[PDB]
Amino acid sequence: DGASSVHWFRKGLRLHDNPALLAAVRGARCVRCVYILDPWFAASSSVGINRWRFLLQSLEDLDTSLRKLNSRLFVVRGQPADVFPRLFKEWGVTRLTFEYDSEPFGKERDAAIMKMAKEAGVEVVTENSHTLYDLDRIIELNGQKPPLTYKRFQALISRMELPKKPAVAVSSQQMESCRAEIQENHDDTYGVPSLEELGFPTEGLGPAVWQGGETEALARLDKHLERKAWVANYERPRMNANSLLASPTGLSPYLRFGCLSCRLFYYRLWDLYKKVKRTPPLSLFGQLLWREFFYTAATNNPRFDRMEGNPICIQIPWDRNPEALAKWAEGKTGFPWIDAIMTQLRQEGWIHHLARHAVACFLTRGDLWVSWESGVRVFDELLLDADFSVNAGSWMWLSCSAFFQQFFHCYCPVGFGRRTDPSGDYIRRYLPKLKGFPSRYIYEPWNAPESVQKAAKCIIGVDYPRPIVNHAETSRLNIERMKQIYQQLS
Numbered sequence: 284d285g286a287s288s289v290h291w292f293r294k295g296l297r298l299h300d301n302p303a304l305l306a307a308v309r310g311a312r313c314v315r316c317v318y319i320l321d322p323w324f325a326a327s328s329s330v331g332i333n334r335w336r337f338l339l340q341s342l343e344d345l346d347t348s349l350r351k352l353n354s355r356l357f358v359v360r361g362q363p364a365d366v367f368p369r370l371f372k373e374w375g376v377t378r379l380t381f382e383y384d385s386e387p388f389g390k391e392r393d394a395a396i397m398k399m400a401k402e403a404g405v406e407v408v409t410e411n412s413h414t415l416y417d418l419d420r421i422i423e424l425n426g427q428k429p430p431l432t433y434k435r436f437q438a439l440i441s442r443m444e445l446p447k448k449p450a451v452a453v454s455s456q457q458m459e460s461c462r463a464e465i466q467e468n469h470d471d472t473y474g475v476p477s478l479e480e481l482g483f484p485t486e487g488l489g490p491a492v493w494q495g496g497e498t499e500a501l502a503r504l505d506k507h508l509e510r511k512a513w514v515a516n517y518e519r520p521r522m523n524a525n526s527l528l529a530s531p532t533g534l535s536p537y538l539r540f541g542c543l544s545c546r547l548f549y550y551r552l553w554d555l556y557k558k559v560k561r562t563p564p565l566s567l568f569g570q571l572l573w574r575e576f577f578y579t580a581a582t583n584n585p586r587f588d589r590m591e592g593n594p595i596c597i598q599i600p601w602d603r604n605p606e607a608l609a610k611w612a613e614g615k616t617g618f619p620w621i622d623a624i625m626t627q628l629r630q631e632g633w634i635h636h637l638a639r640h641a642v643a644c645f646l647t648r649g650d651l652w653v654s655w656e657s658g659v660r661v662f663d664e665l666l667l668d669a670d671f672s673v674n675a676g677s678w679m680w681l682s683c684s685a686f687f688q689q690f691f692h693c694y695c696p697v698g699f700g701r702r703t704d705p706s707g708d709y710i711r712r713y714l715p716k717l718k719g720f721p722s723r724y725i726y727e728p729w730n731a732p733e734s735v736q737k738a739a740k741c742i743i744g745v746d747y748p749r750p751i752v753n754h755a756e757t758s759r760l761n762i763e764r765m766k767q768i769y770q771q772l773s
């Protein structure tokens with residue numbers, strides 16, 4: 284008997300490698316694809332334009348793909364627990380499918396939806412295609428606790444099966460054949476909203492730096508894996524000036540939103556390795572495996588993104604210092620390297636991993652001694668590839684709050700920028716008021732003589748702030764404070 288299926292998109296914003304959508308379509312007489320947009324989500328959230336644009340473009344891409352099958356995405360406004368009982372009844376739904384969400388809040392949401400579906404006689408299929416592995420199996424093999432160091436994580440997956448292959452494509456004919464009839468007035472209630480409807484400034488015609496959606500994700504995957512980019516990204520990568528700029532081969536926002544399947548990426552990367560080198564080391568997959576590590580650590584920890592009450596997080600007496608945090612968030616620290624990174628982050632929504640180290644170090648144990656929780660929140664607002672798991676996990680790791688086995692130094696907020704882009708042009712690009720400083724002073728403009736500042740038309744303390752801490756003194760004290768925090772545990 285043919286099902287009437289709803290496939291619910293949350294992440295997994297793609298039709299490729301979508302085993303939950305395959306489950307929705309196989310043996311269905313009727314299929315509808317829904318995204319549930321909480322109309323009051325923004326009331327309690329402060330997420331910025333770049334993330335909203337990326338989401339909306341990802342939904343528009345799905346809707347465009349469905350329109351090729353004479354269908355539409357249904358953008359349903361409400362909260363899932365309110366909406367699904369109505370939808371079930373009004374549409375006569377017999378099956379609901381969705382990609383598994385391992386994050387503690389999503390798991391609790393989904394468990395409630397599954398109870399309500401069971402009560403209503405609705406079958407539920409979930410599939411765990413957001414990650415490479417069954418995170419629960421990793422935890423089970425580790426004595427029902429997540430690994431807290433990367434080598435232990437690697438030991439566990441080394442005695443597990445390999446990640447599932449990407450699921451086969453859903454039949455275009457089958458999905459057009461089983462489509463729900465779209466009503467001509469679909470856009471009264473189910474349309475994808477425009478950015479301007481959300482109060483954002485009018486969008487230009489030119490492309491965003493990071494265009495949302497599955498189509499873009501797959502095009503980028505193809506370029507990413509060209510043999511001509513192999514040496515540059517996998518054989519001999521270098522963190523040079525060009526590396527700081529958003530790359531047309533970058534994949535991390537697409538992986539975070541699910542526009543790109545991590546299993547497809549993993550196996551296409553394996554394929555390219557086998558062609559270039561004729562079994563790869565785990566380090567080939569390091570970007571995905573670190574992501575998987577943080578997902579495994581987060582899934583059973585509802586307080587993962589907080590300090591207090593978080594069983595893996597050392598309790599550190601961070602400073603209450605809202606003024607410093609606001610200067611850090613707005614790129615007004617007076618350290619051009621820090622400020623340029625935070626400006627790039629706000630303007631575009633992505634910054635290099637080593638730039639994340641730099642700014643997180645500066646906020647937390649390196650300089651300002653502000654809680655990593657506040658950095659998580661700013662990255663949640665601005666970073667395209669941030670989610671509950673990798674964002675809090677990375678901040679805890681970087682700040683020596685969790686996963687700690689050994690101390691590692693924070694980069695110098697002057698010297699690291701100097702070394703990464705000796706020309707200073709990264710600074711001139713994102714902080715054009717500093718553009719006239721010669722390269723010798725642009726990363727430390729408070730050290731420029733009065734002559735140089737006048738010729739650069741930028742008087743430090745007036746046109747651009749003085750550095751808000753003495754780094755040498757402050758970092759040495761912060762190191763002593765952290766060492767004591769850890770040594771006294773004994």
Ligand SMILES: O=C1NCCN1C[C@H](O)Cn1c2ccc(F)cc2c2cc(F)ccc21
Pocket residue numbers: 573636639640643644662666668669670673674675677678681682
């Ligand atoms: O370089 C290494 N070594 C181990 C892992 N890793 C890569 C990091 O995960 C990169 N990264 C993030 C990725 C997504 C995100 F939302 C937040 C962060 C983030 C926060 C930080 F404070 C510092 C680094 C950060």
